[model samples]
Target: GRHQPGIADRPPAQLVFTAYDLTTSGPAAVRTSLAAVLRTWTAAAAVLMRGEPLDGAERDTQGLGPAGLTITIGLGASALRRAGLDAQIPAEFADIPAMPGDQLDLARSGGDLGVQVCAEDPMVAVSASRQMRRLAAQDARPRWIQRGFLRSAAAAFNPGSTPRNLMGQIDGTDNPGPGTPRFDRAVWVSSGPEWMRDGSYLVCRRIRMLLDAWARLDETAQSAVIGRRKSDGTALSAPPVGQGGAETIQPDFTARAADGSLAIAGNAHVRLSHPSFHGGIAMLRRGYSYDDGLDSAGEPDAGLFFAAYQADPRTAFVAVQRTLAAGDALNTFIRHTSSALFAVPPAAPAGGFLAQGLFG
Candidate 1:
């Protein structure tokens, strides 16, 4: 028997983030389009509809148990403005503040709506994106599309140690585990507007890595920039003072060398992005590495498709990114090419449509 999948059920093997712009169609038309898509794909899949689209008609989803399909829908600021639902926008959905070193491309930076598709199979992911764009074609046009993948399930020892980025570094090492109170606290929107009670906010950044330059650095130089050993992804620290056991210790930002200098450079990526330095604000990172192939210069245009879920972007992503933009060593090797922010509504109850209260 098939079971309905929850948004945080497990890590997906394939994921794609597609942003869209609502053209001549109004909110009502887009809403009907989404409801129809949900009805059609109800078989062996899970779908999450958000934003103004959720304020649509209920369609038949009978006999098609969720097949691990979970689609998360969100509305960008422009979408709300177009629909005259601006008053319902959450306070945390404010525009992302301009950072010190961002070179964002406007065409790919913002959108009226966004859909995030995640599936165990790459084919399923692709199908979902296609159906979405097709159904909403009359009302919306794709603004930007980004596809990403994780290490094969066979290679992952556990969910925590899933994948490494193009830079050869284990990412999301400190993410809060799903189904835990910590995860709920970090990602779920519990308060604020009634329309967003169970919803969350997502921040997406398309960062392009300068592989040509990063490749030139030796292992030692690379490790220093990240503040972790490339061999084991462990924090850079001497063996324990008492025991010589295997458990890696936390990064020692204050650790110094014999020459009375900081062991981890002050501008190290780990030091600046550390939660302690950012008022304990943390985000649920679900990013993926991307390789868009070689650029005009023949350099590989690859980097991380950084995506994070949080209760509020103001205290979480924004605060952390500000510090990174100002001085993180990794910033030198990467460029922020595009960005977007969306408010993800909570899941719909059984036999009930999504975001019903917003329209009411």
Candidate 2:
């Protein structure tokens, strides 16, 4: 089966990730509705991606090209159980436990399905999402929708460099390169059930960055918090090598700073989440910075829409976050406000809808 494009493709400037819930109460009805939604969505996505106009897509996206649009679908755990397809659920489809730093909002949390739309142009992403919501209206309604973006200019200026997060620190510097075997081993579901053979697991988190508090800290303090230099994103724990670019260099954890202190602080975000300590677990992250305007107090509600893909959340995101939530210095200035996990399935076969094997 062909793989989903969003998993390995280069992320564009915008993201609109919508979560939908099947409203039918009866188990049999829920199954029928769920299958109907997927069937419609899978076919509609292919059409939309090919730059073809769907019925009713003209209002917001008249005469627009695809602009690199992609729609990736995923299923949630409860959705399967409610549909009496418990056996189809993979063993690795585990719920994320509440971490210590979470200020979770029930309204912005879980859903039965996830529809991820991405494009270089915001309007293109928006148009696709609008049509998807309309298409699924008969079966499921969107529960929560989050929109985010990376800086278009920055991404264009440096194609391969890590983009800065809302906090102004480079993120995902250590991610496995897209076409590498490490990425394949870390993200693709090779040993899963037949339907999920080429798919991957997704974990979505709305992590709000407390900019006001974070701004109060000096550059030095900020560097200590993240364990990297703010200017060039160089690891503080790495040894000098003729002033070469340091983003790709592996950090020397044992390297000592002045006064015999550990170069990378024990509670720094980089060190705690580093692969070395977590059995070399790696998660391919595609994050977009989100700004939802100001709260009642005039404080900006802006943060990272953290999206991670991996073979299994149990050994990757869960393992690293448990340590980060407990003691990472960066935790104080950030909040995990929303969380949802999905089990993505392999792409549909030619002219086939997704998750067809489950029904078979």
Candidate 3:
């Protein structure tokens, strides 16, 4: 089920950075130049340190260290066009963050589109950051500059949305797909004060994974530990555990099954991410991949700088975290070291620029 295209295992590791171009040129031209330039950067890089997990939570947390990831420049429309992407580029890049509904409907409901670039080196990233900053400095464009990190915990064995902490279980199993019935119940949309659309807010955290202990667990134990059937998608014990399931799995708060054991158990990783179990909190996630290199212990050097959008991190983010912090086994392998929460304002109309208000 994991097929993360462009997200790879080679190094100098991958760090995703974004730049919202304010250039007068169309999205094609911007996409062309940026892609070409970044392609060159990839060619000239010395190493790859992409997002991979090492051992347990503590070691996993180091991926987002001081160097974190350099600015992961996500292209808005203008940038996309500038890069000389084909007419179908929009459609081609569509699958990422792999939303599962009507694109227009999602957009109308306030979901945003994003394009990305991966850097092979911190120097490459530093160079890219400087270049984009200069464009912003010259007023040639207004860019959103963000620095990403490289760590062990954020490793994704295969892309798609499943995050493999050192444990290698498919995380976020109980998550709602975009605009699906589950999403409708889990996500909260805000009324537009002025054109805010019905969009929700987003919050992101860069968590590291622990690989050492993860590797120690045998495959059978690993599967059982993750609480999912190794052969099929069903839970090891629980039924489908979602709205679409025929089982009609209702929300159970007691945390105990009829036989008298903890439903999710104290050592289960799903206990952290089983969405509904966290008081029905939900988020629309959009994150990029990064790699720094394997550490001396032969672990993935980078981790995920996780980003999510919802109406409020406090409400949505807090509830899930409170649940995980309580007794989820995932906590053993995952650690939240650094975080950034932004109330992403709406994207401007065509030909409009971001942050004009900050300077206006």
Candidate 4:
């Protein structure tokens, strides 16, 4: 009951991440507007998730059913600061610094509020996103809107069936399982203030993939870059690193190849991002592939919307991302364009709204 759905629920086929900046400046006005928005959203969600219209008369959905819809709300630093509740901000809540490989667009980054809508059906996700923004239109404006899709909602629950990223490498093969103790350790915020109890922090990054440049590399080169088998997502080196199935097994970073070189490259993506490499820190990655047609340079404008959720970002995402940003072999084929961080609260109590405790 403490945890939110989207964090452990199977990632769906589509995602709509909308970040909103509050227009109301005064502390009282900001808190009032935010509370109103959440109250409206909480009411709308109960109906929308049941495949019903908000007013019970709108035919917007055309009877699409629930389509496994889920809406998750999060508060950014600005939100807490503006509401005169800065004390509620988690100690680990901080702005993501620009990494060496980042090409940030400020317009697409931070916001006071962030909403993540996920559904198996694209229309369900899109419609819900628009409705949410419409509700916030009076008091907030969308700072950025990012839409994307995953392979499926039910597809990646198992080990080998993990979804693929834009690079064709099986992504998220090493996530802390939804029902495992490791997942709870890596995610649920157990010791924070009451408002954040059972909550988690999300580090959002819009990474642009260099498809053409990646395609130039031979299959071997590509596999070496990621340090995993392209076909099945198995570790490139020896297995049984700890104990699990093929996909969950860690690559023996110490293993050597035929030519006497280390098996997984020194700077391979997986090797660099490995939990073992970061004091065993981990994150639940709910990533989706996004295609925005083509950029002005004529290259495909596509990448992964990396949503990393963790109990403590200071030890998890920030630590790992810094390592990756420095020497990851995959760095050449990708660019971090936008970044955001949010303190997602636990689900609202029945008949109540998100962050209501903090509002008081």
Candidate 5:
């Protein structure tokens, strides 16, 4: 589970896109209104997208650089009963507004809408937002507004327990342990934001990889590229296969041993995930996957829209991104087409929107 709030069930996200310039009062006010609308829309079986009050100013401080109000509408298998919207939306998209043509193709290809938009621009980005809002209004639905979060990936070219990029290599064996003294030392923290206390910073990167060419590489050569074993996730030429940072096992500086043969190979998830890259750092990760189907050539249209959260981006996000930008092996497939940074505002208090008594 995320350190922050997340709706448990992965609700159907028909038109999931964020809106800027909402003309709201503050995070507290925005969240309060969004929640009420979400409840109403859900009852009508209209799934809504949610996140923080994402705006240009907020992204600078919070980890959600791509900050914007995301609205997700659910598409039930029903005709477009709503009036003008049916004529306005493209027939291809209106047939299934919730699962539009492109988004439908993506879902079939094992990807999500949010991930697809992570690296995209305001054109495609705002289009998605408008689509969702249209669906909500046409269906007589309410809007849901919440805080936004960073989206990390299932695999990384860094130090962690995970393995296997699109080519199937154990990646990120070496990583920092969460909730540890070392972790505490790295993440930023102050007494300002009450809800975001234990929470750390976030970083998101949308990466695209080439599986066809990777599949062509021999296993040994592939391992060499990543600087780690294909399955075990051990460093190249290391004596004993030691863990970089597996908290379940006994803590041992010896566990992080690495042979000099591998020099943090480019695109190696371990290289991007290594704490040393940023001089000891730690942050939480939450990301989704995306696929656009075939380009002109008809290859697997797959990519990773990355997102992570830390207390401070200058330290954790910038550090890791800089290292990845330098020479990580995974960079071959991953390009930062788009990027944003945002701070997560404090959580809203319980009770009605104005019940906290700021006025009374």
Candidate 6:
């Protein structure tokens, strides 16, 4: 779906996050192994496999076509260190700082490499990951794998409405559309190293929600925490009674209640994450709700698989998350568990491997 080799353009129905450690292989071997894998999975959509060298023959081993699949490859800080290409790391690429309320699990936190496999059909997505594992056998090893999905809610009513998360809130309401200048400004890295000019930085956080606790609260309480009407996602600031404005209207954060209380709570999730409060900084959020069954205590282990792409995460993600981490009311109901930051290289030129610039 992306015009370039990285398929960040389309909205995938299903996806898998597979992170790898490349410490086992040298630069040349890593490049060659990735290139061979790319050749095996070539299709209409982007194939972001790295490396050089070719492997002959291709087969649909899983009986599934591309299904509009998009595979995006990214390099973690560890990858650059191991490949001896630390000098080529983008200026903005670095380890994400620990947030205020984070309970990070080291096993899932960072990786040397990452590949996002996405497709319409679930099997196709799975197959892609399997292929990557086999191809990188000698060059890298798996570190962490997370699978996520998106729901086509109310498709017949409003096909274009934003999807809902497990929390029952309409997610990604303020996102810039794909072709808009705002989107390009926030998402695509327009200038940097030659290899990263068109690439975007990726930030991923596995947030676990206490759904049982959340369900105990009434609708009003839930809406207050979110600062949006649960039924329609309309901002609480929508003019009372005869007020004119839609659900997507800018919230009047300063509005007061009859008792002089703030209309939108001080620590409301929406208010904290608002661009107006963050120096107009925003990221392209492409998140999915994941229910990973029950935990040890028999509680549901489910929450948002939060992912965002930005030109520079330091400005877009870190700046905004810092505020949310410290005081967001939503934090009471969710915990940030696993975190990762990746430097997504620009789309490779024709016949070039995804990370070809590193070798150059």
Instruction: Name the best candidate (by TM-score).
Output: 2
Clashes of each: 3, 0, 71, 0, 62, 3
**Model 2 bad stretches (over 4 Å):** 153-155, 239-242
Clashes of 1: 3
Please tell me which predicted candidate would have the highest lDDT against the true structure: 2
Pairs of colliding residues, candidate 2: none
User: What tens-digit string does per-residue lDDT give for candidate 4 at 9-28?
Assistant: 88888999999999988888
**What does candidate 6 score on TM?**
0.88
Writing each residue's lDDT as its tens digit, candidate 1 over 83-110 gives 6667777789999999999999898888
| Model with the higher lDDT, candidate 4 or 6 | 4
Candidate 1 clashes between residue pairs 3 or more apart in a chain or in different chains = 44-67, 45-67, 46-69
**Native-referenced Cα lDDT, model 6:** 0.75
Tens digits of lDDT, candidate 3, 1-360? 111112222212444444333344565444444444433323222122233332221332244443333222223333334444434222212222311121122211111222233444455445434443443432233233334533234354543434433244443445566546656444434443332233234444545555566677676566545556443445545545352433224334345655776554455655555555556666655444434467468776454556655554555666666655666654555555334333333333333332112212
Per-prediction TM-score, please?
A: 0.84, 0.96, 0.50, 0.94, 0.50, 0.88
Instruction: Tell me which of candidates 2 and 3 scores higher on TM-score.
Output: 2
Q: Name the regions of candidate 6 deviating beyond 4 angstroms.
A: 1-8, 23-65, 153-158, 239-243
What is residue 349's positional error in candidate 5, in angstroms? 2.5
**Candidate 6 residue 187 C-alpha distance from true site, Å:** 0.6
Report the number of backbone clashes for model 5. 62
Native-vs-model 1 lDDT? 0.73
Question: How large an RMSD does model 6 have?
Answer: 3.9
Q: How do the residues 1-360 of candidate 2 rate in per-residue lDDT, one tens digit apiece?
A: 368888788888889999999989988998999899999999999999988768766567776667779899999887898899998888788789888868998888989999999998899998899899999998999999999998674546776556888899888888899889999999998896888888999999999999999999998899989888887788887643357747788777788987689998989999999999999989999888999998678888999999999998999999999999989999989998899999888899887888888778
- Please list the Cα RMSD from the true structure of every candidate, rounded to 1 decimal place: 5.6, 1.6, 14.7, 2.8, 14.8, 3.9
Give candidate 5 misplaced runs (Cα > 4 Å): 1-3, 6-165, 171-188, 191-200, 237-269, 296-299, 352-360
